[PDB]
Design a protein around this ligand. Sequence first.
Ligand code: CLA
Ligand code: CLA
Ligand SMILES: CC1=C(C/C=C(\C)CCC[C@H](C)CCC[C@H](C)CCCC(C)C)C(=O)c2ccccc2C1=O
Ligand code: SF4
Lengths: 185, 70, 127, 172, 48, 49, 92, 645
Amino acid sequence: ARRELAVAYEDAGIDLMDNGKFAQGLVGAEAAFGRYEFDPIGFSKYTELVPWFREAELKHGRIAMLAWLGLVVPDFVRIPGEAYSFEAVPRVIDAHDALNADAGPNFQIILFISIVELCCAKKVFEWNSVETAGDYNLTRLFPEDDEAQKQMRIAELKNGRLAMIAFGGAVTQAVITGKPFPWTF
Amino acid sequence: RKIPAGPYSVSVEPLRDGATNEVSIVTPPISSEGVQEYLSLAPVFFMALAIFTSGFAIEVLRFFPDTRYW
Amino acid sequence: VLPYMENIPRAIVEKEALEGVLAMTPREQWEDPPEDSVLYTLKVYAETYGEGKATKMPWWDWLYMRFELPDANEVSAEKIKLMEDDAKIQRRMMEGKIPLYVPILGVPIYTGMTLDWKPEAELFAGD
Amino acid sequence: GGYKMSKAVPFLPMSPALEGYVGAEEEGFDPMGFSLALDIRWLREAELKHGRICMLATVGWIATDLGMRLPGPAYQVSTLEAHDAMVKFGPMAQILIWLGIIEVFSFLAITNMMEGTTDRQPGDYGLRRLYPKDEEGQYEMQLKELRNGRLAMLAFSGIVTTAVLTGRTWPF
Amino acid sequence: KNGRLAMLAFSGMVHHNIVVKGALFPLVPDGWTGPEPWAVGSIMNNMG
Amino acid sequence: KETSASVPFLPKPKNLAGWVGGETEFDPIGFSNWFDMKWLREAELKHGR
Amino acid sequence: LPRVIATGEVTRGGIVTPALMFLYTTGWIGYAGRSYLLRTKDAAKEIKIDVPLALTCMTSAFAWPVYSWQDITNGRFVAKDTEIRVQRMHMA
Amino acid sequence: DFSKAAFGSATGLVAKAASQTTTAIWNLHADAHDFSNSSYLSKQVFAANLAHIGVVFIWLSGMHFHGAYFSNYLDWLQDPSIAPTAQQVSNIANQSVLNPIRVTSGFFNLWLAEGITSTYQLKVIAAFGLIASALCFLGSYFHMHSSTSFTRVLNTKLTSLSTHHLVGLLGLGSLAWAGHLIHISLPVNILLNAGVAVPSPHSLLSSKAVATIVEQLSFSALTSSDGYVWQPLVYSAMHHFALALVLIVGSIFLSTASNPLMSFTVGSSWHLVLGVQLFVTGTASVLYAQMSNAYPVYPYLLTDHPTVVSLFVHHMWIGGFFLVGAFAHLSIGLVRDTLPQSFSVVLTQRDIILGHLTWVVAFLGVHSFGLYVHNDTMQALGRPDDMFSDNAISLLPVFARWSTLTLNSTGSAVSVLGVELSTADFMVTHIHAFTIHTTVLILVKGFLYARSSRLVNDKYKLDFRYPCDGPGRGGTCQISPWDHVFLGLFWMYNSISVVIFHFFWEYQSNLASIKASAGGSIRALASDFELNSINTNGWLRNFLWSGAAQVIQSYGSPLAAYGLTFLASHFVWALSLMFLFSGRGYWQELIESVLWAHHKLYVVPHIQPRALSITSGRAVGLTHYLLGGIGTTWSFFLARIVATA
Ligand code: CLA
Ligand code: CLA
Ligand SMILES: CC1=C(C/C=C(\C)CCC[C@H](C)CCC[C@H](C)CCCC(C)C)C(=O)c2ccccc2C1=O
Ligand code: SF4
C-alpha cells in the first residue's frame, strides 16, 4: 500500500495529532529479534516533526551510501583524466582538497546538488507527511504488495544507517591512517 | 482575520488545514492609478520639480560655464 | 476550565505550557483575551485545531504557530510563575515596607535589608 | 484522485498558477513555486522576453564569431571585446536608447494587461503573421516558441561562458 | 503626416549637422569611419 | 476588448474618435486622457507647420 | 574684479537684462501658482497636485505680464478690502 | 490598494478640514516613525529595523564603490603616507579646487585590515552590499506585510532572542571574523609588508599554503616576520576567538530567566528596550572612540592623523547622541505605560535623587569653572604662582597615576598607559565630569518628572511631547520629558564639544612634542595643551583662534570646502538662535499679515499657513543648533588636521 503520491499528498502538512504508535508508525524499528524502538533521547516524542526526522534520516543514509561507495571505488579505479589520476591525487580523501575552487568538478557537483535540493525543498517543507517522508517518486523497482514494501523500506533504512556509521569510520579511518580501501593501520 | 496581522497584508490566514497548494502572491497589490496618484503628491511633485530645476541649472552651468555672456 | 482549553494536542502547546499561561494570566482575563496577549493566540490556535477540528496544518503555518506560542520551559516554567508571584508580592509590600537596594557601579544592587520607608506619623508627608 | 502533479517534477503538485498556460499541460515545471509567490503573468512575460532576447543573442554571437561583421573599421573586433569597443564607439548606447523606447512601451503593455484594460496575453504583442488560425496550432506554436527560447537561453549561457573561458569562435 | 515627417526630418537634419560638424548635404564625408565619440564627462566617463 | 489600431498590445485611447489623424489611434502614453485634445491638435499642427 | 553696473545703462555686465529675465521668470512662477490655486480651490488638490492641470497652468503662465495687468485693470486680480479677512479686531 | 494606502496619511490629512493646515504636515512628519500601539506594532518595528539595515547596506555598498572607482586605494597601498582620497569632484561651477577630497573615515585602513588589495574586491563588496540591501528590503517588506506578529519577542520569546544574539549573532560573528583574520587578513598583510606579492585570497584556503608550509605557531616565519603593522591583527584574531569562546560558553552557563518587561505594555516595552539599547550603543561608541587612539588596531591608522581625529570625534558625538536618546526613550516608555509600577523606588525618591544630583552638578560646575576662572584672573593680574598649574598650586590627579598590581603573567596595560597627567588634565577631566553630570541631571529629571511633578500633577495625562501646561503657576513652559531631552541635547553638545576640544588639543600637543626632532628631550612643559589649557583665555587663544587659521585661510585651496562649511555652520547656528529665542505667536501674527497680502491678490492657499508649533519650533532650533555647532567643529578639526597633518 504505497498510496500513489498524488493521493498521498492529500494528508500532507505538519500533523498535529499522535498516532499512538512508535514514531508515527514509521517503518524502521523492525530489528532482527522483535522491534528495536530505539529513540533513547526522545526526539520521536516531538511527533509533528517525525516526518521531518524520517526525511532527514533517509537523505543522510542516501548521501552516506553514495559517499562510502565513492571513497571505496576510487581507491581502485579513477575517472579518465590527468586531474583524477592516482598520481595527481594519491588518496581519495585528498580528492576534496585537490580539485575544489577553480578546478571545476567539486564546485559543479556542489552547484548541481544545490539546484536539485532547492528544487526539492518544497517536498521537505510542505508536501511531507508520515507516509511520504523520503518518497521522491523514484519507486520504479519498488515491489508491490505491502510486506514487500516494508521489507524494502527497512532494507533502505538499515543500509543507510550502516553506511552513515561506516562513512564516519572511514573518513576517520583514512585521515588517521592514509591508506586504500582497507583503512586499517 | 483572527490571527493579528497588520493592515495591508499579503499574508494568507495562518489558520489553514493540511498543506494547501494555493497561490499567494507576495507582491504588493499596487494600482497604476494609485501609483500615479502617489507620484502626484505635493512632496513628490515639488521635489521632482526641484530636482528638474537643479539639474537644468547644472547643465546650463556645464555647457555655459560662468556668466560669459553678461 | 474553559471548553476550548480542554484536550488541546501537545503539538499546539504543552500541558505544562498551558498551565503556566493560565497561571500568569488573570482569571477575569479569560473568555476574551486581548489581541496582544499570549492567551488570545493560544485560544485562536486552540480552535480550528484538535479533536474533531483540523488535525493538520501547513509547514509555514506550523512555523508561524511555533513562533507565536510559548514552549513551556524557560518561558512558562513554574520558576517564572514563582518569580512573578514574588514580584507582585514585593510590589504589594513596598506599599508599606520597601526593600533596600543601593546603586553600586551605577546598577542597583540588593543588600538584603528591607526599609521602613513608610513615614511614622504622616503617611502623605513628603519629608 | 486529486492534486494534479507536475509532469516534470513528479513529486511536487503542479502550481495552480500554471493552469491555462502553454507549458503546464505537458511539463508544469515549477518546483520552487515561483508562480505561487509571483504573478504568473509577470513570470511568463519575463520568460518570453528572456527567451526572445537570448534567441537573438545566440545568433548574434554565431554571426559575430563566424566572421559576419558590419562593413566598418571600428567593427573589426572579436565578440569578447565587442561589448567594450562598441560601448566606447557609441552604438551600444544607441541600441540601449532604442530598446529603452521599446521597453517603455512594453512597460505600458504590462501595466495595461494587469488592470484588465486589454485582454492581452502575457507574451502577446499583436504580431500574428506566421500564427495558425486553429487553436491547437496556436498552442503548438507557442510551445515551440517557449522551448526554443529556453534552449537558446541555456545555449547562449554556455556560449558566452565557454568563449570567455577558452577564447574561440563557437564550435570550440 | 507631412508635419510629423518634417518634424522628425528637421530634428534629423540638426543632429546630422551636429555629428558631422558640417553641412547637411555632403552626408558621410570621405574617411568617415563613424562619428567622433561624444565629448564632455558623464557618470560613465569617470568609471561609473 | 477594444485595442488601438496602431498599437495592438495597448488599449484603444479615447478622445481620438472624431479627429483627422485619429483613425490610427496612436497614443501609448495617453496624453489624450490628461490634456485637452484641442490644445494637443493645435500644438501638433503648429509644430508640423 | 569685474563690476556690475546697476545704474540702468545697457552695458557689459549690466543689470537691466538680468532684471528683466528674472522678473519674467518669477512672474511666470507666481502666476502659474496663482492660476493653479484659482483653478484648484481645494486643499485636496493642494496636497495632491493635479499634475495635468498644474503643468497646464505652468506652461500657460508664459503670458503673465499682460494677463496680470489686464486682470489688475479689470478688477479680477486684486480683491476688495471688504471681501477678505482683514485685521479689524480693534473694531474699526 | 497598497499604492493607495502609501499616501493614506495625506488622504487623511486632506479628508478633514481640521487637518488642512501646514501644522498637519509637520505633525505628519513628526509622527512618522511614532508607531502607535496596535496589534502590528512589533511587526512595524522589526520591519523598520530591517529597512534601516538595508539603508546601511546601501551606504556600505556606496562606500566600497567609491573605494573601487573614485579612490586612490592602490596608490595608498603602495604608499600609506599619501592622502587617502575616495571622493572625486566633477568640474561644475568652479569647485575644481577641491577635486580630490581626503576622506577621513578610515576605510582604507579597514580594507587593508580585511586583506583587500584589488579594487575588483571592492567592486565585488559593493555589489554584494547592494544584494544584501535588496534582501533586507525584501525581508522588511515581508515582515511588515506577511509574517508573524513579533509581539512575543520582548516578553515571551525574550529568552530565545537574547540567547540567539549571545550565541549565534555575537559569538559566531566574532568566531567567523577570527577565521577571516587568521586565514586571509593575516597572510595578506604578511605578503604586503614583506612585499612578496599577494595571491588570490581563496588560494590561502588550500591547506598547502603557509597553513602547512610551516607548522610553527609563534612569531617566526619566512625570512624575518618582524612586521609590527601585522601584530595588531594577530591580537585582534586572538581576541575574537577568545570572545567567541567565552560568549558561547557563558550563554549556556547563564540563567537568562529574568524578563523585567512583564509589567510593561508592548509599546512601553519596546521603548524601554530601545532606551537601554541606545545606552549600550552610545557607551560602546564612546569606548571605541577612546580605544581607537588608546590602542592601535588598523594598519597605518595612527600615522593618518586626520583619520584618528575624525574617528574619535565622530564616535564621541554618536555616543553622546545615543546616550541622550537612551534617556529619551526611557522617558517615553515610562510616561506612555499604563501601570509603570516597576520604577516605584525611583519615582518615590524623585526629589531626593534629583536634589542630590543637583548639588553634585552645582558643586562640579562651581569648582571646575572656578579653577578655570581663577587661573584666568591670576594670569590677568600677573600672578602666575597663584594659578592652578604645575609651576603653581598643583592639582595633580593622583588617582590617575597608579595601576600597579601583582603581575601573574601580564604586561602592557598594567600602568597609566605610559602617559603622565598634570593639572590641566585634572581640570579638563573635571569639566568633562561636570558636563556629563549636568546632561544626566536634565535627562534623569525628565524621566522622573514625566508622570507627575510638584508643579503639574497630571503630566502623565499630557503624554511625552507637549509644549507646556500654560503660563499658570508662574509659567510652566518646558516641563515635558521631550523638553528635558531637548535641553539635555544642548548639554550633551556642550559636553561632547569640550571632550573633543580636549582630545584635539592634547593630540596636537603630543604631535608637536614628538616633533621635538630627536635630540630635544626636555619637553619641559611645552605641551601647548598642558601649558595653556588652564585658562579660558588660554583655550580661546591657543586652540580656537590659533587653529582657526587653517580653516579661515583655506580659500583657493582644497580645504575651501571646509571653510565654506565653517561659514554655513555658523549661519545655521545663528538661525537656530532665531528659532530658539523666538516664539510661535509672533510668527503666527506675521503669517496673518502675509496671508492677508496673499488674499488681497486672490492667491488664498487652502492648506492654511500656520507657523511651527512650540515643540516644532524648539525642535527646529535644536536641530539647527546641533548642526551648526557640530559642523563648525567638523570643518575646524578637519581643516586644521589635514593642513597641518
Ligand atoms: C536607535 C535609534 C533611534 C530610534 C529607532 C528612535 C525612534 C524614535 N524616536 Mg528617537 N532619538 C534617538 C534615537 C532613536 N530614536 C536619539 C539618539 C535621540 C536623541 C537625539 C532621540 C530623540 C528623540 C525625541 C526627542 C523624540 C524621539 C521620537 C522617536 C519616535 C518617533 C521618531 C520620528 O517620528 O521621527 C521621524 C524622523 C525624523 C523627524 C527625522 C528628521 C531629521 C532629524 C530631525 C534631523 C536630521 C538632520 C540630519 C542629520 C542633517 C542633514 C544633513 C545636512 C548636511 C543638511 C521613534 C520611536 C519622538 C517620539 O515621540 O517618540 C515616541 C520624539 O519626540 N526621539
Ligand atoms: C570654585 C572654584 C575656585 C576655587 C577652588 C578657588 C580657590 C582659590 N582661590 Mg579663587 N576664584 C574663583 C574660583 C575658585 N578659586 C573665581 C571664579 C574667581 C573670580 C572671582 C576667583 C578669584 C580669586 C582671587 C582674586 C583670589 C583667589 C584665591 C584663591 C585661593 C585662596 C582662596 C581662599 O581664601 O579660600 C577660602 C576658602 C574657604 C573659606 C573654604 C571653602 C571650602 C571649604 C573647605 C569647603 C568645605 C566643605 C565641607 C567638606 C562640607 C562637609 C562638612 C561636613 C563633613 C561636616 C584658592 C586656591 C586667592 C589667591 O591668590 O590664592 C592663591 C585670591 O587672591 N580666587
Ligand atoms: C522663524 C520661526 C517660525 C516660522 C517658521 C516657519 C513658518 C517654517 C517655514 C519655513 C520654510 C519651510 C523654510 C523653507 C526652507 C528655506 C527656504 C531654506 C532651505 C532651502 C535653502 C537652503 C535654499 C516659527 O514658526 C517658530 C515657532 C516657534 C519658535 C520659533 C519660531 C521661529 O523662529
Ligand atoms: S511661553 Fe510658550 S511654552 Fe511657556 S507657558 Fe507660555 S505658551 Fe507654554
